[PDB]
Amino acid sequence: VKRPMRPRRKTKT
Amino acid sequence: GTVNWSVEDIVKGINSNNLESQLQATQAARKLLSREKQPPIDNIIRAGLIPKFVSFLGKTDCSPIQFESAWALTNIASGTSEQTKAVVDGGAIPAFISLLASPHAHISEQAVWALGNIAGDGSAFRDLVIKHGAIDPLLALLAVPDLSTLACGYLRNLTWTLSNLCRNKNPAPPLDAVEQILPTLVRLLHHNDPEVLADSCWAISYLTDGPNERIEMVVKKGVVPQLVKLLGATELPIVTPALRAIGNIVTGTDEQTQKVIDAGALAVFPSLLTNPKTNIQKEATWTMSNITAGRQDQIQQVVNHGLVPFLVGVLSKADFKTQKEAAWAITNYTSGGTVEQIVYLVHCGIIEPLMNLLSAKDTKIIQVILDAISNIFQAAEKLGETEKLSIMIEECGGLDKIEALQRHENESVYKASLNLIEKYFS
């Protein structure tokens, strides 16, 4: 069988 | 002018009944919140200014105060989950969606950025931005014949925000929202900008991290060839999400895996399995382990491309986490391969580095290796050459390890180790 196993926020300056 | 104001002065100006005094104070608040060293986000929130900023978003006759407040709210929403929540609780979401259709491009771009920070908090806010109806106006900003006529930074923010709408699990984004976004997302995946490409691959990366129904939705749009092209890119920020999406796709059905093979993906793996970045090497090995778990004609395609020696090499020397993924690739290879394919694995030199890793201080890799040895011996029986293989394991010092693994804590390790020395005595 198979085995199942990029910034969320940006500030402007 | 508006540099280095106190919070008390900012409050005094915003609470005045003068729109231009309020504009001056909001700019001073934006400059405080855009400093590198500890922006006083919590202080601004406690002063009660978020509701005032939200109302300023709607003053169409004074676009400078729309922009300054959107910038200030963008940076508050970039902090902790409690700080993003304060922005949402103030009513910001519908106000930012209205600003998306502003005739001023710098204000519309700022609304895209703010909605990206809100949706990036997690599944709940992501779905709440979608329910407020953000997708239609977002995609309308990209409905041009050629994306190159848009400003570079405007296009990068739109791709990033969209990727945050594809992100996070438990739950995944709504199916209808994904189907509505994908055509634009695929167009962005063919654009020439490096940052647009990286964030588009991350979006495809997110959409393929789930059940086979999600994988098929992506594969149906025919993005697999373009993913393979980006898989061989020079830029590291593009290769990393490209490989993640390929590895996600090969967790699905054998037919979906075969589309990756047909696009020529295996030709890129000589480099990926020797990449100087530890993370690229591990993810490539993990992907190989899911490919050797497929059909025999797929294992054969792994053989034809010459990747078995590269698995021998990674097993010989790599970071220990990459080595374990290679041990999995071998056991999947041996359990589903033919006899001719299992002996070819021995002719390449798998036995010595496989034995040398039995000295590892990990129980799971021990079990995986031993089960692989069993499958290899079973194929030696079918040919009647078990004597040769047992001699081979002894000469390199593998028997000393197998027999030492008898006196092991884990019961399963002991039983398999004993069963091996009883059947073949090496």
Side-chain angles (χ1 to χ4, degrees), chain A, chain B residues 75 79 110 113 117 121 164 167 250 252 286 290 325:
Chain A
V1 293
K2 312 288 194 74
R3 298 166 57 253
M5 187 180 179
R6 58 180 308 174
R8 30 191 51 179
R9 294 163 174 169
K10 294 182 172 182
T11 175
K12 184 180 179 182
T13 308
Chain B
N75 286 14
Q110 200 65 50
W113 196 330
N117 278 341
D121 178 62
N164 273 6
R167 188 172 188 159
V250 300
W286 165 63
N290 283 322
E325 289 294 345

Side-chain angles (χ1 to χ4, degrees), chain B residues 180-426:
Chain B
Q180 184 181 349
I181 291 175
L182 262 168
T184 300
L185 195 52
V186 178
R187 285 166 52 209
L188 294 168
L189 197 68
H190 286 74
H191 196 63
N192 60 61
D193 184 77
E195 280 180 63
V196 166
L197 286 171
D199 282 326
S200 301
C201 278
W202 280 115
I204 299 290
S205 160
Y206 304 145
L207 297 182
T208 56
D209 186 6
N212 306 350
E213 46 246 41
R214 298 297 184 113
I215 298 175
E216 186 73 2
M217 207 181 343
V218 172
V219 172
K220 196 189 63 56
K221 309 298 292 187
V223 307
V224 164
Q226 178 69 0
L227 284 175
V228 175
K229 175 185 169 189
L230 299 170
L231 189 67
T234 60
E235 294 89 337
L236 197 79
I238 301 181
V239 174
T240 294
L243 179 54
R244 182 74 58 88
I246 293 290
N248 282 338
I249 293 175
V250 300
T251 73
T253 67
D254 293 350
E255 289 75 23
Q256 296 163 339
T257 295
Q258 189 63 40
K259 290 216 139 48
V260 175
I261 298 178
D262 286 310
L266 292 179
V268 200
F269 274 79
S271 273
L272 300 167
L273 297 165
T274 54
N275 194 286
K277 292 298 172 179
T278 303
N279 200 80
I280 302 291
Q281 217 174 96
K282 179 200 55 160
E283 302 228 2
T285 311
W286 165 63
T287 305
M288 287 301 305
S289 78
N290 283 322
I291 295 181
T292 61
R295 306 194 230 100
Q296 291 183 343
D297 57 288
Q298 287 168 341
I299 293 177
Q300 186 62 44
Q301 251 154 343
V302 171
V303 172
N304 296 342
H305 283 91
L307 303 183
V308 175
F310 284 92
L311 291 174
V312 175
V314 158
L315 211 62
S316 300
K317 162 174 170 282
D319 264 29
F320 177 73
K321 269 125 194 185
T322 308
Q323 292 184 296
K324 192 186 311 307
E325 289 294 345
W328 266 111
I330 298 304
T331 302
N332 295 339
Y333 184 107
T334 61
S335 80
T338 69
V339 186
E340 309 87 277
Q341 292 168 343
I342 293 170
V343 292
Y344 168 72
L345 186 65
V346 171
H347 293 333
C348 287
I350 195 71
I351 293 299
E352 171 157 77
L354 200 52
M355 293 301 156
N356 181 71
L357 268 181
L358 285 176
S359 306
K361 316 161 197 169
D362 187 316
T363 38
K364 280 144 191 173
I365 191 175
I366 294 278
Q367 304 160 263
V368 174
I369 292 169
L370 290 169
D371 184 53
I373 299 156
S374 171
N375 299 126
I376 298 175
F377 259 117
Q378 274 181 265
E381 291 178 6
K382 288 196 183 186
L383 292 174
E385 306 169 36
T386 59
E387 288 180 291
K388 317 194 180 195
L389 176 52
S390 39
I391 292 181
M392 201 174 193
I393 296 181
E394 172 169 355
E395 191 262 326
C396 66
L399 175 58
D400 298 7
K401 298 180 176 59
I402 301 175
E403 68 186 7
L405 268 55
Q406 295 171 103
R407 313 167 170 279
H408 196 70
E409 302 174 301
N410 267 239
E411 156 196 11
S412 177
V413 180
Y414 185 35
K415 294 178 164 171
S417 164
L418 284 188
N419 186 25
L420 212 62
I421 74 173
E422 283 179 10
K423 282 194 212 168
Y424 319 93
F425 297 117
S426 286

Side-chain angles (χ1 to χ4, degrees), chain A residues 10-13, chain B residues 10 14 22-23 25-34 39-41 44-45 49-50 52-54 56-57 64-79 83-84 87 92 96 110-111 113-114 117:
Chain A
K10 294 182 172 182
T11 175
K12 184 180 179 182
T13 308
Chain B
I10 293 171
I14 284 175
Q22 292 175 319
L23 170 54
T26 299
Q27 178 177 83
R30 177 266 292 181
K31 289 184 177 181
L32 277 190
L33 298 167
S34 61
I41 294 175
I44 296 288
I45 295 179
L49 298 172
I50 290 174
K52 296 300 296 181
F53 293 158
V54 171
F56 294 165
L57 293 175
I65 204 175
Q66 292 182 305
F67 180 66
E68 292 286 351
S69 62
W71 190 345
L73 287 173
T74 293
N75 286 14
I76 302 179
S78 77
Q83 291 160 344
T84 305
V87 174
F96 280 119
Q110 200 65 50
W113 196 330
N117 278 341

